[PDB]
Amino acid sequence: SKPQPIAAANWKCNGSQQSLSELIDLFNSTSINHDVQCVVASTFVHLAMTKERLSHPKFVIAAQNAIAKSGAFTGEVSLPILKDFGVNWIVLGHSERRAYYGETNEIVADKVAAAVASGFMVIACIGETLQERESGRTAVVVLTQIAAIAKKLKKADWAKVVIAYEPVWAAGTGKVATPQQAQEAHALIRSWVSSKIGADVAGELRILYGGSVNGKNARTLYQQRDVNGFAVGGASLKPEFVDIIKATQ
């Protein structure tokens, strides 16, 4: 059967003290009857508030980015700073950082390896753009992305690693990913891990769908063989995120 599902809330660069606290109150009051690891990834600024307010046993807190080491890097946040601050989860290599902030396949790989070495649970993000998919390069792109990450990891490190597939080709492009299209991408990633890392690792690896979801389509998406949860964007700032949690059973 599937490993423990994950419902990750990527709040991105959003939220006020009031709006986020209200949403945290809803999460705290939400009863969850099945084994699922829920994750709340707030901005660095809201990490303190989230730590103090979030109390649900099946919820942990994550950062949306970091650099490997502390030092002369004005504006950035390092892994030791997050570790000292009690944050043990992190989202790395998000498509927006790959696009906007110069994070190459190797830069993402270095951050992930650094985070794992520091003891973090890591949600590593991969996925192809519309240009790459339409040019028939979905497979080569996503496999190159995860190959770069694996190059800096050992087999034992994958116990701390989570893979999130972002259908970037469907992000504000007008396109819509079908459950079949998502499954095909997940199965492809699964197949690579099995042959390159191990069938044991592949069986335990959580592959999260990182595309647009609501309560309804998330239930359908979780029916797919190689979908192990969701890395949610916009819907994670809404009460709808509760439905997405329930979508993982």
Residues 6+ apart with CB under 8 A from 27: 38, 40, 54, 56, 59, 241, 242
* Alpha-carbon gap, residue 137 to 43, rounded angstroms: 33
Residues of the binding site for substrate: 10, 12
Cα–Cα dist 184/190, whole Å: 10
* 3-state SS assignment for residue 6: strand
Minimum distance between the CB of residue 2 and a copy of itself, rounded to whole angstroms? 26
Q: Binders of a copy of itself among 96-135, rule CB under 8 A?
A: 96-97, 100-102
Site string (169-198) toward a copy of itself, x via CB under 8 A? --xx--------------------------
186 or 190: whose CB is closer to K ion? 186
With the C-alpha atoms ordered 245, 150, 166, 117, is the resulting torsion angle positive or negative?
Answer: positive
Is there binding between residue 1 and a copy of itself (CB under 8 A)?
Answer: no
- Give the separation between CA 15 and CA 9, rounded to whole angstroms: 13
Return the residue of 179, 198, 215, 234 that touches K ion, per CB under 5 A. Answer: 234
Asked if 199 interacts with a copy of itself (CB under 8 A), we say no
**How many chain residues touch a copy of itself (CB under 8 A)?**
42
**166 a catalytic residue:** yes
Which 3 state secondary structure label does DSSP give 90? strand
* C-beta closer to K ion: residue 158 or 241: 241
120 close to 68: Cβ distance less than 8 angstroms = no
CB 166 to a copy of itself: min, Å: 10
Burial of residue 195 (CB within 10 Å: 0-12, 13-18, 19+) is exposed
Which residues have C-beta within 8 Å of that of residue 1, sequence separation ≥ 6?
Answer: none
Q: Which parts of 154-193 interact with K ion (CB under 5 A)? A: none
Question: Quick one: which of 77, 126, 149, 227 contacts a copy of itself (CB under 8 A)?
Answer: 77
Binding mask 64-93 for K ion (x = CB under 5 A): -------xx---------------------
Query: What one-letter code names the amino acid at 228?
Result: N
Q: Which spans of this chain sit near K ion (rule: CB under 5 A)? A: 12, 71-72, 212-213, 233-235
Q: Which spans of this chain sit near a copy of itself (rule: CB under 8 A)? A: 10, 12-17, 43-49, 63-65, 67, 70-78, 80-82, 84-85, 91, 94, 96-97, 100-102, 171-172, 233
